[PDB]
Amino acid sequence: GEKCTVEPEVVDSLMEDCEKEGEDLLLRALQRGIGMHHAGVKGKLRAH
Amino acid sequence: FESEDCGDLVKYVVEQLEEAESRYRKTNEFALYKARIERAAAAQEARR
Amino acid sequence: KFTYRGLEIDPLLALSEEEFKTLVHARARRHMNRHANRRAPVLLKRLREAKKDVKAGEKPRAVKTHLRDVVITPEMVGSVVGIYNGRQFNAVEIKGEMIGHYLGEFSMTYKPVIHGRPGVGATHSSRFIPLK
Amino acid sequence: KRSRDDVYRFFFTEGVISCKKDPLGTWTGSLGGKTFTVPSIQVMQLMRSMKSRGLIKEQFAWRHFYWFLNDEGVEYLRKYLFLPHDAVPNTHK
Amino acid sequence: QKRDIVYADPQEGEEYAQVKKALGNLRLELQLADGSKAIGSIRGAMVRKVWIGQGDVVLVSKRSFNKNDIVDVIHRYNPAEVRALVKDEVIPRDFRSSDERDAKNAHSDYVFVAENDDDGGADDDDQNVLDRNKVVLDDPLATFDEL
Amino acid sequence: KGKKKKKKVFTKPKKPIHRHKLEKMRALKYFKVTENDDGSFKVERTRDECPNPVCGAGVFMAQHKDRKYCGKCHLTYAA
Amino acid sequence: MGHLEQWRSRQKIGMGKGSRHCVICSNQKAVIRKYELNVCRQCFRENAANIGFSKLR
RNA sequence: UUGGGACCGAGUAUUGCAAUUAUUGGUCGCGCAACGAGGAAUGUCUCGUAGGCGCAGCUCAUCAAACUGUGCCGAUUACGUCC
RNA sequence: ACUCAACACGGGGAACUUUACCAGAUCCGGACAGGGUGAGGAUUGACAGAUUGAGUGUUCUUUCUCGAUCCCCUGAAUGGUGG
């Protein structure tokens, strides 16, 4: 939605990190303000 | 609860959204959309 | 009614291949001679099949083909043929005045153009035309 | 595609094979003196596999191929045709 | 590239405000969309990479250590985003005060509304999909005859 | 030039791939053997060979309901 | 017979400006040459003589 | 106007595996379709040149108002200056 | 490709091919075998009928005919007028 606090550069750097660690296309799904988390996601990226 | 479940869910939703993006490549409003932006860009370039 | 050369339907049908290609224009003649050896192997059959089977009072079942390099003889008259413009099989029924032609001529391969206001770059002189 | 054996017998007593790069068949010595005839693609496949196994040494120039076949090549062949040899170059000189 | 629009965080300084006039020595005169009159400054990454004109709308910061010292322009909102902001729900267009509220300066000033996006074109993407593997009629000349 | 990535109109039955249709112990289904008479074994066949040079060796014909066929020289003696 | 008879046919007939292909590379754009039945202009002639050609004039 | 043809209908033969959106020739009709020395402005040229005229090669089943090359007929003015 | 150093220019006068682009179907040109396949193996090709634009075994039904590399699964390789 409209309301966000986070600055763009922040987001874009995390999004970058997704590309390289890509698995289930957590890449695409996160870019959709649409995210998953469980054990099968790596510790790093799920924290992000 | 895990494993296949959460992935079916997420995946399917990304599908549906990507679907609705395609339908809006049927392109009327989106067409004028592109038609504009492009014009502005060209104008700016010419000015510079 | 229809007169191809002052011939109704029954005379045309009666003509053998020789008597036929004599009667037709120069292209059609040139075509037939050069060809021989079938060169519409399926496009005869498919028509004459569904043609025969009809109980009349309505047209034959439609047949589809890509080909359009084949003549129109008085044999295939009355049929319903598909002809393919590169995305659509197009509907044509074969009249007695379509003899001495090809198939492709009745099937358009482009949309005719009708325009929609010229944009910038048309007119050399500059005004940056609002809004189209 | 069992013109294999013929091709391998053209190799042994030459050490060299050549073929055009073309998709339409032609004999890959242009004369062998045993008058074999093979396609083009079939030939190409044979030498391709054996190359990846290290048995061939490949050369391309223009629209063609020149095939030389190693010391290693000789080994593989002798086992496949079940035959010893004195050696390929000594017989030729 | 990236977003052209950010929103204020009410904590950690940062409040919307509007330029009034400009003053020498990189400083300018600046006024609050709730509070009273102020004087601003500018940061050295905008010292002539960005030009902040008069009546442009911007996002300040405020000093952490001591309030009511001076404030500074840390961002600029492009005019494209100003109209959008002002619309939604957010800031006043009269920038409460104006010079002052007790003199009610610059009266309506009736809303403008960017209601100009759609021109009555761009209707219906709900229509047909492809029909292929059908013989269908479709000969031109249509309309050409009404006799 | 330029390019894009997407192909899917799809959502039909697509083709299965052709896959060999197996007959097991093919020789014994052709050659028929008998009760033993005179200590000599009598060998008959349900498959008769085609008379062309190519098929002149051992190569048998076929048997369909309405036709007979030869898979070697692609021929029909029609029933 | 089937698919094989319907694959690579219409230019093992040999016709038009298809089925040319230069000797030097295999590129068939930019004109194979018919002029004295040489081929070189698709590996460019600026790159290669060794045919006995030189610019004297 | 018998100056020019643009468009347009019918017939025929050749090229090619395929000429339909007429491919190319070749004869009849269409000429009553333009256009009567051309505004502001603008192109490159000094002798076998400018201009006029035709042929071949190139591409290549077929089609050159293009490009590359060769030949024929063959001038006017200046041979100066820095605006 | 866009002032002079874009615009009868990319030898670019393209019917198919050429050809990038669009609608549809086909083929492995996936090397290298570590992992699976008894004499039938894994496998190749096809008349006829049907599907289909297709007297295209593409695919199915049917049966016949054949190297066992062809075949099945990951890794990897490859090709590309894609950037």
3-state secondary structure chain D: CCCHHHHHHHHCCCCEEEEECCCCCCCCCCCCCCCCCCCCHHHHHHHHHHHHCCCEEEEEECCEEEEEECHHHHHHHHHHCCCCCCCCCHHHC
Q: Give me the CA G18–C1' H62 separation in Å, rounded.
A: 16
The answer to whether residue C24 is domain-embedded is yes
Are G24 and D62 an interchain contact pair (Cβ–Cβ within 8 Å)? yes
The answer to whether residue C132 is domain-embedded is no
Mention every residue, 6+ apart, whose C-beta is less than 8 A from residue E136: C88, C89, C90, C91
The answer to whether residue C119 is domain-embedded is no
Q: Order of strands across the sheet with C80-84?
A: C80-84, C89-93, E135-136
Are E6 and A2 an interchain contact pair (Cβ–Cβ within 8 Å)? no
What chain C residue is nearest to E135 in terms of C-alpha separation?
A: C89
Task: Transcribe A1-48 into DSSP letters.
Answer: -----S-HHHHHHHHHHHHHT-SSSHHHHHTTT----STTS-HHHHH-
The answer to whether residue C27 is domain-embedded is yes
Note the helical H segments in G1-57: none
> Which experiment gave this structure?
cryo-EM
CA angle F70, F73, F77 (to 5 degrees): 45
Question: Which tokens is E2 given?
Answer: 């990236």
How many domains is chain C built from?
1
The answer to whether residue C124 is domain-embedded is no
Pairing of strands E57-61, E72-76: antiparallel
Q: For residue C4, which of C18, C22, E75 has the smallest C-alpha distance? A: C22
Are G8 and D21 an interchain contact pair (Cβ–Cβ within 8 Å)? no
G31 touches strand I (CB under 7 A): yes
The answer to whether residue C123 is domain-embedded is no
The answer to whether residue C13 is domain-embedded is yes
Contact predicate C41/C48, CB 8 Å: no
Residue nearest to nucleotide I23 (CA to C1'): C87
* Distance in Å from the first CA to the final CA of chain C: 51
Is C85 part of the contact surface with chain E (CB cutoff 8 Å)?
Answer: no
The three-state DSSP-derived secondary structure of E6-32 is: CCCCCCCCCCEEEEEEECCCCCEEEEE
* Residue length of chain G: 57
Query: What span, in angstroms and rounded, lies between the C-alpha atoms of E123 and B28?
Result: 7
Owner of token pair 């040459």: G33
Range of the domain at C103: 1-114
- Hits for CB < 7 Å against strand I across F residues 7-36: 9, 15-26, 29-30
Residues of chain E positioned with their CB less than 8 A from the CB of C89? 133-136
Domain regions of chain D by residue span: 1-93
- Report the CATH fold assignment for D1-93: Arc Repressor Mutant, subunit A (1.10.10)
The answer to whether residue C121 is domain-embedded is no
